[PDB]
Design a protein around this ligand. Sequence first.
Ligand SMILES: CCCCCCCCCC(=O)C/N=C/c1c(COP(=O)(O)O)cnc(C)c1O
Ligand SMILES: CCCCCCCCCC(=O)C/N=C/c1c(COP(=O)(O)O)cnc(C)c1O
Ligand SMILES: [Cl-]
Lengths: 386, 380
Amino acid sequence: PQLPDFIQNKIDHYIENYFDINKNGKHLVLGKQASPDDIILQSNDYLALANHPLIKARLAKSLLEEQQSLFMSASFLQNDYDKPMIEKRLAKFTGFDECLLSQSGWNANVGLLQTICQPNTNVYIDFFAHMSLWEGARYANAQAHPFMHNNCDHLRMLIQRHGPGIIVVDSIYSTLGTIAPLAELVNISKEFGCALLVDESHSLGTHGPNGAGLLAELGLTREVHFMTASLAKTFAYRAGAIWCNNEVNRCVPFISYPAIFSSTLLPYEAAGLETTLEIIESADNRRQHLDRMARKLRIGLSQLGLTIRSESQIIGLETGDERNTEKVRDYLESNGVFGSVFCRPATSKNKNIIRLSLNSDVNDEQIAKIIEVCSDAVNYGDFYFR
Amino acid sequence: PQLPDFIQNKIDHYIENYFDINKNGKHLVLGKQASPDDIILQSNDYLALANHPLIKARLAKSLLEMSASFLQNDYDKPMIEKRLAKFTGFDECLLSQSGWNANVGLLQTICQPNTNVYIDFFAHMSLWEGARYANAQAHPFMHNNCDHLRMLIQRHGPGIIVVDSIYSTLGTIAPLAELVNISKEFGCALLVDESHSLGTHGPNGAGLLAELGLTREVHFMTASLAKTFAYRAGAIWCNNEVNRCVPFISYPAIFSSTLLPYEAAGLETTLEIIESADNRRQHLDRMARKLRIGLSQLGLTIRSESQIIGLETGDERNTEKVRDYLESNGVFGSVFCRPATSKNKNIIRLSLNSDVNDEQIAKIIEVCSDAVNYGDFYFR
Ligand SMILES: CCCCCCCCCC(=O)C/N=C/c1c(COP(=O)(O)O)cnc(C)c1O
Ligand SMILES: CCCCCCCCCC(=O)C/N=C/c1c(COP(=O)(O)O)cnc(C)c1O
Ligand SMILES: [Cl-]
């Protein structure tokens, strides 16, 4: 069947503009194939749990136990006896009143926002908040008011102008790894009668007592209305969750379109999460090691004169435009360093990033090596850094 | 902290209007807990594969022992995709995290801000929302009504025609052959969501398009793999190069984590079982026809031509009464209400699967017969 010219031309153009323009003819995010000894810094499995034998054993076990044939909407599974223990456990874990399982962090954000927003609703969103939060607001037809990254002064001015709303931030930001000024955001929330929504995808498991997160680390838990997280990072699982210090999670399952109209996690998936939680709660050792290696990389790269905004295990090399980004990517890759290209639609076209994500398995030698490769890239590379 | 009024007010009213008015103070979809004796007709696992010993073994085995945008190199793309393309007769297949994401991502990839999307009034919500997120121009056409569609396309110009092969709430079948003609005639692209026909229909379960010999004139086919394939994923099929681009354009494809590599191996075994389940397809088809005839003759509107049977129960108060009657008598369907239906056209859906018995079919007809005679409520 021949595509109509209205679609054919769009694909033809995309291919020319997004694939062809690159030396290797692939999309920018696709470099060379890595090798065993290369240093890979791409996975969000921060505490290196993907292959944990206890997690695998518990998943396989409950999977082998059989089937409830629960291939249907989670809307139908909201009777207390159908709700998975993992929700009660995750709630207790973070200190929030209630938790609701979602199919992904994306759906948790889109779902929560749909539930708490009306079309008139003011949404004060950090310019660098995750796309799912921007999109969640847009799907709900809310009135979004972006504030400059981590800028509480700018935020106050916005709220003073537009009224009570929902303040939306990442606790730790996904591209550049900065940390939100959470204590002050809470004070602003309280001052102006707003609700706070904190996405802890990148701090949950890695931060706080027993890995309960940044809000728990800072003692803010009881002062925040909402928290969300992808469970695809530290929890190493394809799912998400919404936590509420109120009754909102009673309503989300029947209001959120992704919650209603897309199939539920199967019971055996929830059970595997229970073991993951247990391992995370006990992983003080890995948390400490990760923190230290991350501080080492930050400091080391900073002394190079590189712009390093990060205060976390996420480190963003700012490589400007797509041409310059290809060059840096190639140089990094040729030498044994494999980060992730972040580019448009995630960034603006002239502010691409090569993201280095650290995990608790990275060691002191690999760190030193990464500093060295970047040192050379600076000194000698035929390209620039922002 | 207490919610600000602008949230608290909304939640308060919602709970009053959606939970409080029902006899059990819960949302309308929540009824009684079933007993092992009861007939359960809620799962979309049509060929009853959720607990198949071989599927569970393949997954356990494979498991024992980031964004998919980054995984689009030849060597990173899973073999299940090539097997699914072959199974279906379409040129290429791309895995997605859900049928919802499949539809949303495809539409985001092929739509522009004013693209005409000619969508069946009853097409899945994911297709409606996918068009909406893309800021496409939606032109709903009355259910299965090709006259209305011809008028809309004549009026608004070429665009994308979007239907379910089998419709999720009432089990009707799209007039696919005629829809193909229309798209050819009007220079449109056709998108068919086969979530409810894939695995249950066609040669080896290849689906409705394959059954009808239409594969080669449809541009796109999508499906939730959470129905017959009994897995939390979806897939986009293309008779063209579109899947080359989806992975870098669709927001769900870019910004939400990928299926893990062991999940694809489970799909491979599932596909093999489905290809060979002629027995179960046959039995299911027989039971579904038996049910439609039995119910129709009671005077209920039964629009279904498939394994999905929709009891039309009108407004919410009536629907609650019907639900409670059914459940009290050992028949458990799924309530479909608003935002899925209009508030006055609720449905109690019966999803048949290949494990369902002759004796069970008779019992459902019997319960519905008595319900029709009871006097406490109506059916449309
Ligand atoms: C507040 C509850 C309102 C009534 C209950 C509605 C239940 C809706 C459940 C679904 O819509 C499941 N849909 C699956 C699906 C999908 C998405 O598949 P997945 O995202 O579940 O894989 C796509 N296309 C079609 C035709 C589909 O049927
Ligand atoms: C055409 C390539 C564009 C550049 C590459 C973009 C890669 C983006 C990958 C992500 O955004 C993963 N995001 C996860 C995430 C999510 C969504 O969670 P999940 O749906 O993956 O469970 C929510 N919140 C935060 C802060 C998150 O970081
Ligand atoms: Cl990623």
